[model samples]
Target: QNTLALNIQFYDPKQLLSSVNQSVSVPYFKLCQLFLNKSIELCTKHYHLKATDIDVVDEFHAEGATLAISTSHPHAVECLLMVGTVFQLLSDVLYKRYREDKRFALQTRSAVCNAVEAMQIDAKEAAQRLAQHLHAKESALYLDNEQLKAIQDSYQLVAMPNPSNVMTRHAFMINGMNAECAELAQNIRTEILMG
Candidate 1:
């Protein structure tokens, strides 16, 4: 009887390519860097973990070197998506405002901007896939009220303020997870418009 290493067996490139083809453009190592950077920021700032403890740079360097050499291999897409998913998960943790309290301000201004840009890129890629899947046909018939509301709820988690320049609404009708929804919405909406 032979024992097989489960980890190596599970990371078959063909399976990963089947899941996400050549659609996404960002490189695997770059995405990994972003993921690791954000995670390091969160841990060091929010969780009070020492930056030395996280050891982000060395891990990124090793993984990045592996990815760089794998470019000619069949496993590239698989590696890319896996790397992208890790970063996306780390970024997703900041979706709600409550996390900010536990989290310190981003160490640099551009970090937040870059993270938001990445989110929009992801949304556009997803929207493109969705559009193709639906054959570019727009339909609201499939979504029931509850499902629609839930989708709306996700967007409404951060509200937009002072619609005077755009639209208007009731006074007492409240919205948003916090009073700072305006800036948050502006940041997100601007990033997403490129999509």
Candidate 2:
């Protein structure tokens, strides 16, 4: 119902005190703008300030979601290409949070959206493994791996660079997705630190 409201919790992706009570209500008309602002903040951590422009636009139509990521930066070759990771980051959330009834309709992001779906199964899997011992000093270690990178090398469709796009993108996507995803990227920590 366009007339209805969706109480959105723009959780601090950096994992600050982004409690549920901190949500902001948005009518259907406000949806686009709201996600736009949050998207930039989401991207900030991903590009690690290397990118000057980051844009993610979301759409909900016919019971499906579409999230488009656009960038004007030169490295966009990889920036846009690495969008795969962000896509996966979004995919896991619904299941991880244990949600239902509101069927997690498929979402999109065009250049960024088109490809991520295929490879992320591995992306999410490898990431979870890293998380197992994350509480240890392992968190300081890298999610990047030669073995994992080889798998991703075949996984990617169009992007390269940025530590092989797949891992870096997944790393950034994990940050873009939530604050509790602590080891994904330090940019997440920096966001909470600077803000």
Candidate 3:
């Protein structure tokens, strides 16, 4: 058939998922009861579903969607480039940390980490290189930690927002940790330049 109608079942593909990400995955029928924890009954009553119904539906739809893809897809190359570049950079950092500091690597609950140092190398120069390849303007490129003090100051505010800043303590922690990654990512540029 020349036409395909897709019903996508969504989830956060990133290794680290937040509550926001999980809730955003709700389907049309499920969306109505998303605010209620015990809304499964409502979904099941209308859809004739089981506990794993979403997963099954998602898989079927995914299969059907994949069947619709062809060799003519143009954006696939850029998508692969973006994902592949990040994957290699992150994987290298993880591997390096795993080798040098086994215990410290678990600073951010396995996938994410409080230790910002690990990310420094990848973040520093990645955006520029990608921008060059993508043929974007230099100003449009976004390398992390271009303004280190601004980033650090931002965390300081969150870390001590009002002396009553409950929500932002966690935000500060993440910011500080990610800043370390930005610094480390800069090192990746040096490594590249040396070789």
Q: Per-residue lDDT for 189 in model 2? A: 28
Q: Clash totals for all models, in order? A: 0, 4, 14
Candidate 3 error regions (>4 Å):
1-73, 103-195
For residues 1-195, write the lDDT of model 2, one tens digit per residue.
001011112222343222222232223214433333443455544655432254323333222222333323333323333333333334334324433544222222222222223354332233332222222111111223432242233232232224343433443221132332324333432443355
**Runs in model 2 lying further than 4 Å from the true structure:** 1-39, 45-58, 63-72, 81-84, 98-195
Every candidate's lDDT: 0.25, 0.30, 0.24
* Candidate 3 lDDT score relative to the true structure: 0.24
Clashing pairs in 1: none
Candidate 1 — which residues are off by over 4 angstroms? 1-26, 57-195
RMSD of 2: 14.3
Better of 1 and 2 by TM-score: 2
Alpha carbon lDDT at 69, candidate 2: 30
How does residue 31 of candidate 1 score in lDDT?
44
RMSD of each: 19.3, 14.3, 21.8
Worst 10 residues of 3 by lDDT: 106-115
Each model's TM-score, in the order given?
Answer: 0.23, 0.30, 0.19
**Predicted model with the maximum lDDT:** 2
